[PDB]
Amino acid sequence: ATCAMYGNCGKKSVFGNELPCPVPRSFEPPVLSDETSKLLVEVCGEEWKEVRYACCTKDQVVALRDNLQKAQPLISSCPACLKNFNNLFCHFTCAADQGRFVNITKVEKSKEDKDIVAELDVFMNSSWASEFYDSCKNIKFSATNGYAMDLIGGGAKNYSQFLKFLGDAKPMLGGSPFQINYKYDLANEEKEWQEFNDEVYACDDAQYKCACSDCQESCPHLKPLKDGVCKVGPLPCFSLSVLIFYTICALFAFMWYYLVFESFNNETNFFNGKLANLFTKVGQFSVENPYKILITTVFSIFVFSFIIFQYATLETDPINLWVSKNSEKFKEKEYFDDNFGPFYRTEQIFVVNETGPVLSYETLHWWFDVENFITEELQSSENIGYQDLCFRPTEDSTCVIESFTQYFQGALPNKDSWKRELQECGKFPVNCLPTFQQPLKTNLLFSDDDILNAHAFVVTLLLTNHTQSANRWEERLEEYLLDLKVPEGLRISFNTEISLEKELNNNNDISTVAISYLMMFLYATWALRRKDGKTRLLLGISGLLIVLASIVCAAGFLTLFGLKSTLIIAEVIPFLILAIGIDNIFLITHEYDRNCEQKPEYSIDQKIISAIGRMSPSILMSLLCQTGCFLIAAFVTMPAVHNFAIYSTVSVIFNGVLQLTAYVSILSLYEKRSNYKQITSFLKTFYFKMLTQKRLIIIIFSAWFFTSLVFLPEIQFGLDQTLAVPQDSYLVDYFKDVYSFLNVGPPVYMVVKNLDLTKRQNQQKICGKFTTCERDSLANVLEQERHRSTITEPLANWLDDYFMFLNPQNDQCCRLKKGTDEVCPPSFPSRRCETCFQQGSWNYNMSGFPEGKDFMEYLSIWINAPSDPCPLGGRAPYSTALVYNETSVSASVFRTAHHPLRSQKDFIQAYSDGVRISSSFPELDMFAYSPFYIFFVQYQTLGPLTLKLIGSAIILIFFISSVFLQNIRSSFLLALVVTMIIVDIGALMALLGISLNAVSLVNLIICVGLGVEFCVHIVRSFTVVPSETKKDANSRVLYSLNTIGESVIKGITLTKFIGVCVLAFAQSKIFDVFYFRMWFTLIIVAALHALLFLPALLSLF
Ligand SMILES: C[C@@H]1CC[C@@]2(OC1)O[C@H]1C[C@H]3[C@@H]4CC=C5C[C@@H](OCCC(CO[C@H]6O[C@H](CO)[C@@H](O[C@H]7O[C@H](CO)[C@@H](O)[C@H](O)[C@H]7O)[C@H](O)[C@H]6O)CO[C@H]6O[C@H](CO)[C@@H](O[C@H]7O[C@H](CO)[C@@H](O)[C@H](O)[C@H]7O)[C@H](O)[C@H]6O)CC[C@]5(C)[C@H]4CC[C@]3(C)[C@H]1[C@@H]2C
Ligand SMILES: CC(C)CCC[C@@H](C)[C@H]1CC[C@H]2[C@@H]3CC=C4C[C@@H](OC(=O)CCC(=O)O)CC[C@]4(C)[C@H]3CC[C@]12C
Ligand SMILES: CC(C)CCC[C@@H](C)[C@H]1CC[C@H]2[C@@H]3CC=C4C[C@@H](OC(=O)CCC(=O)O)CC[C@]4(C)[C@H]3CC[C@]12C
Ligand SMILES: CC(C)[C@@H](C)/C=C/[C@@H](C)[C@H]1CC[C@H]2C3=CC=C4C[C@@H](O)CC[C@]4(C)[C@H]3CC[C@]12C
Ligand SMILES: *[C@@H]1O[C@H](CO)[C@@H](O[C@@H]2O[C@H](CO)[C@@H](O)[C@H](O)[C@H]2NC(C)=O)[C@H](O)[C@H]1NC(C)=O
Ligand SMILES: *[C@@H]1O[C@H](CO)[C@@H](O[C@@H]2O[C@H](CO)[C@@H](O)[C@H](O)[C@H]2NC(C)=O)[C@H](O)[C@H]1NC(C)=O
Ligand SMILES: *[C@@H]1O[C@H](CO)[C@@H](O[C@@H]2O[C@H](CO)[C@@H](O)[C@H](O)[C@H]2NC(C)=O)[C@H](O)[C@H]1NC(C)=O
Ligand SMILES: *[C@@H]1O[C@H](CO)[C@@H](O[C@@H]2O[C@H](CO)[C@@H](O)[C@H](O)[C@H]2NC(C)=O)[C@H](O)[C@H]1NC(C)=O
DSSP string, 554-587: HHHHGGGGT----HHHHTTHHHHHHHHHTHHHHH
User: Of the candidates 969, 1074, 769, 1041, which has an alpha carbon nearest to the alpha carbon of residue 139?
Assistant: 769
Q: Which amino acid is at 284?
A: Q
Give the distance from CA 796 to its chain's centroid.
21
Q: How far apart are CA 637 and CA 307, in angstroms?
A: 27
The ligand 5 atom at the shortest distance from the C-alpha of residue 353 is: 1
Q: How far apart are CA 87 and CA 97, in angstroms?
A: 15
3-state secondary structure of 932: coil
The ligand 8 atom at the shortest distance from the C-alpha of residue 888 is: 5
3-state secondary structure of 146: strand
643 lines ligand 5 (CB under 6 A): no
437 lines ligand 1 (CB under 6 A): yes
- Strands (E) across 146-200 are located at 146-147, 179-183
Q: How far apart are CA 918 and CA 896, in angstroms?
A: 13
181 to each of 85, 104, 168, 176, how far by Cα in Å?
17, 10, 8, 12
Q: Any residues with CB less than 8 A from the CB of 1082 and at least 6 apart, and which?
A: 981, 985, 1007, 1010, 1011
923 Cα to the center of ligand 1, angstroms: 32
469 lines ligand 6 (CB under 6 A): yes
Phi, psi angle pair for 181, to nearest 5°: -120, 135
297 pairs with which residues across the strands? none
Instruction: Work out the number of other CB atoms within 10 angstroms of the CB of residue 277.
Output: 9
Q: How far apart are CA 750 and CA 745, in angstroms?
A: 15
3-state secondary structure 530-553: CCCCCCCHHHHHHHHHHHHHHHHH
At how many Å resolution was this determined? 3.3
Q: Could you tell me if 1003 and 636 are in contact, meaning their C-beta atoms sit under 8 angstroms apart?
A: no
Indicate left, alpha or beta for 17 from its phi (over 0: left) and psi (-120 to 50: alpha): beta
Q: Any residues with CB less than 8 A from the CB of 226 and at least 6 apart, and which?
A: 916
Nearest residue CA, atom 12 of ligand 5? 360
776 Cα to the center of ligand 8, angstroms: 27
Q: How far apart are CA 80 and CA 205, in angstroms?
A: 8
Q: How far apart are CA 1079 and CA 1071, in angstroms?
A: 11
**Which ligand is located closest to the Cα atom of residue 391?**
1
Q: How far apart are CA 632 and CA 875, in angstroms?
A: 54
User: Of the candidates 346, 348, 345, 368, which has an alpha carbon nearest to the alpha carbon of residue 492?
Assistant: 348
201 Cα to the center of ligand 4, angstroms: 20
CA 898-901-905 angle, 5° bins? 120
Q: How far apart are CA 157 and CA 654, in angstroms?
A: 79
Instruction: Work out the number of other CB atoms within 10 angstroms of the CB of residue 924.
Output: 18
Residues with CB under 6 A from ligand 3: 712-713, 715, 943-944, 946-947, 950-951, 979, 982-983, 986, 996, 1004
Q: How far apart are CA 801 and CA 873, in angstroms?
A: 8
Q: Could you tell me if 439 and 429 are in contact, meaning their C-beta atoms sit under 8 angstroms apart?
A: yes
Q: Which amino acid is at 23?
A: V
Q: How far apart are CA 349 and CA 481, in angstroms?
A: 9
- Residue 446 DSSP one-character state: B
Q: How far apart are CA 422 and CA 413, in angstroms?
A: 10
Q: How far apart are CA 128 and CA 199, in angstroms?
A: 8
Using DSSP bridges, classify how beta strands 401-402 and 815-817 pair: parallel, antiparallel or unpaired.
unpaired
Q: Any residues with CB less than 8 A from the CB of 158 and at least 6 apart, and which?
A: 133
Q: How far apart are CA 137 and CA 877, in angstroms?
A: 31
CA 1092-1093-1099 angle, 5° bins? 105
Q: How far apart are CA 528 and CA 1053, in angstroms?
A: 15
465 lines ligand 6 (CB under 6 A): yes
- To test the pocket of ligand 7, the residue of 764, 843, 844, 851 to mutate (highest count of ligand atoms within 8 Å of its CB) is 843
Q: How far apart are CA 1093 and CA 696, in angstroms?
A: 10
884 Cα to the center of ligand 8, angstroms: 10
3-state secondary structure of 700: helix
- To test the pocket of ligand 2, the residue of 641, 721, 725 to mutate (highest count of ligand atoms within 8 Å of its CB) is 721
Q: Any residues with CB less than 8 A from the CB of 1041 and at least 6 apart, and which?
A: 688, 1018, 1095
- To test the pocket of ligand 1, the residue of 437, 462, 870 to mutate (highest count of ligand atoms within 8 Å of its CB) is 437
Q: How far apart are CA 338 and CA 890, in angstroms?
A: 14
845 Cα to the center of ligand 7, angstroms: 9
11 pairs with which residues across the strands? 18
Nearest residue CA, atom 8 of ligand 7? 847
Q: How far apart are CA 5 and CA 98, in angstroms?
A: 7
3-state secondary structure 403-443: CHHHHHCCCCCCCCCHHHHHHHHHHCHHHCCCCCCCCCCCC
Q: Could you tell me if 865 and 735 are in contact, meaning their C-beta atoms sit under 8 angstroms apart?
A: no
DSSP string, 667-684: HHHHHHHH-PPPP--TTT
Residues in the chain, total: 1101
330 lines ligand 2 (CB under 6 A): no
Q: How far apart are CA 3 and CA 53, in angstroms?
A: 9
3-state secondary structure of 88: helix
DSSP string, 832-847: TEEESS-GGG--TTSS
697 Cα to the center of ligand 3, angstroms: 29
Q: Could you tell me if 755 and 762 are in contact, meaning their C-beta atoms sit under 8 angstroms apart?
A: yes
Counting Cα atoms < 13 Å in the Cβ hemisphere of 849 gives: 25
318 lines ligand 2 (CB under 6 A): yes
Give the distance from CA 1033 to its chain's centroid.
56
The ligand 8 atom at the shortest distance from the C-alpha of residue 885 is: 1
DSSP string, 362-412: HHHHHHHHHHTTTTTS---TTS--HHHHB--SSSSSPPPEESGGGGGTS--
The ligand 4 atom at the shortest distance from the C-alpha of residue 174 is: 29
Q: How far apart are CA 70 and CA 88, in angstroms?
A: 15
Q: How far apart are CA 586 and CA 592, in angstroms?
A: 9
Phi, psi angle pair for 694, to nearest 5°: -65, -45
* Helices 79-94, 58-71: crossing angle, 10 deg rounding: 150
Q: Could you tell me if 660 and 278 are in contact, meaning their C-beta atoms sit under 8 angstroms apart?
A: no
Q: How far apart are CA 336 and CA 497, in angstroms?
A: 19
Residues with CB under 6 A from ligand 4: 64, 67, 70-71, 89, 92-93, 151-152, 166, 174-176
Q: Could you tell me if 597 and 679 are in contact, meaning their C-beta atoms sit under 8 angstroms apart?
A: yes
902 Cα to the center of ligand 5, angstroms: 28
CA 776-780-784 angle, 5° bins? 110
**Which ligand is located closest to the Cα atom of residue 709?**
3
Q: Could you tell me if 452 and 422 are in contact, meaning their C-beta atoms sit under 8 angstroms apart?
A: yes
Using DSSP bridges, classify how beta strands 115-123 and 179-183 pair: parallel, antiparallel or unpaired.
parallel
Q: Could you tell me if 318 and 504 are in contact, meaning their C-beta atoms sit under 8 angstroms apart?
A: yes
Nearest residue CA, atom 20 of ligand 2? 932
**Hey, where are the domains in the chain?**
5-183, 271-315+509-680, 342-504, 681-710+939-1101, 749-930
Cα Rg of the chain (Å, integer): 42
Q: Could you tell me if 156 and 149 are in contact, meaning their C-beta atoms sit under 8 angstroms apart?
A: yes
* Helices 583-597, 1033-1047: crossing angle, 10 deg rounding: 110
Nearest residue CA, atom 16 of ligand 2? 932
Using DSSP bridges, classify how beta strands 102-109 and 115-123 pair: parallel, antiparallel or unpaired.
antiparallel
DSSP string, 53-70: S-S--HHHHHHHHHHHHH
Counting Cα atoms < 13 Å in the Cβ hemisphere of 252 gives: 6
- CATH number for domain 271-315+509-680, candidates 3.40.720.10, 1.20.1640.10, 3.40.250.10, 3.30.1330.10: 1.20.1640.10
Largest CA distance in the chain: 148
3-state secondary structure of 1058: helix
Q: How far apart are CA 441 and CA 794, in angstroms?
A: 13
Give the distance from CA 131 to its chain's centroid.
43
Sign (positive or negative) of CA dihedral 670, 671, 677, 681:
positive
Nearest residue CA, atom 3 of ligand 5? 356
500 lines ligand 2 (CB under 6 A): yes
Residues with CB under 6 A from ligand 8: 754, 885, 887-888, 890
Four-point Cα dihedral 397, 402, 405, 408, nearest 10: 50
- To test the pocket of ligand 5, the residue of 360, 365, 452, 457 to mutate (highest count of ligand atoms within 8 Å of its CB) is 360
Q: How far apart are CA 1068 and CA 714, in angstroms?
A: 26
User: Of the candidates 998, 1002, 1035, 1044, which has an alpha carbon nearest to the alpha carbon of residue 323?
Assistant: 998
Counting Cα atoms < 13 Å in the Cβ hemisphere of 711 gives: 17
451 Cα to the center of ligand 1, angstroms: 22
107 pairs with which residues across the strands? 117
Q: How far apart are CA 28 and CA 1025, in angstroms?
A: 125
Q: Could you tell me if 873 and 813 are in contact, meaning their C-beta atoms sit under 8 angstroms apart?
A: yes
Q: How far apart are CA 1098 and CA 1020, in angstroms?
A: 11
Nearest residue CA, atom 29 of ligand 4? 175
Q: How far apart are CA 748 and CA 895, in angstroms?
A: 6
148 to each of 141, 161, 217, how far by Cα in Å?
5, 16, 17
Instruction: Work out the number of other CB atoms within 10 angstroms of the CB of residue 837.
Output: 18
Q: How far apart are CA 673 and CA 662, in angstroms?
A: 17
Per-residue buried b or exposed e for 130-168, using 16+ beta carbons within 10 Å of the residue's own CB = ebbbbbbbbbbbbeeeebbbeebbeebeebeebbbebbe
Q: How far apart are CA 216 and CA 225, in angstroms?
A: 18
Q: How far apart are CA 54 and CA 37, in angstroms?
A: 10
340 Cα to the center of ligand 8, angstroms: 18
Q: How far apart are CA 286 and CA 296, in angstroms?
A: 12
Domains 271-315+509-680 and 681-710+939-1101 share a fold: yes
Q: Could you tell me if 1013 and 621 are in contact, meaning their C-beta atoms sit under 8 angstroms apart?
A: no
User: Of the candidates 463, 471, 494, which has an alpha carbon nearest to the alpha carbon of residue 351?
Assistant: 494
Four-point Cα dihedral 53, 58, 59, 63, nearest 10: 90
Q: Which helix (H) or strand (E) holds 655?
A: helix 639-660
402 lines ligand 1 (CB under 6 A): yes
681-710+939-1101 — its CATH code? 1.20.1640.10
Instruction: Work out the number of other CB atoms within 10 angstroms of the CB of residue 414.
Output: 9
**Which ligand is located closest to the Cα atom of residue 951?**
3
SS3 of the chain: helix, strand, coil, percent, to 5 = 50, 10, 40
The ligand 3 atom at the shortest distance from the C-alpha of residue 229 is: 23
Q: How far apart are CA 317 and CA 334, in angstroms?
A: 17
Q: How far apart are CA 547 and CA 509, in angstroms?
A: 20
Indicate left, alpha or beta for 867 from its phi (over 0: left) and psi (-120 to 50: alpha): left
1076 to each of 992, 1000, 1048, 1055, 1068, how far by Cα in Å?
12, 11, 21, 15, 12
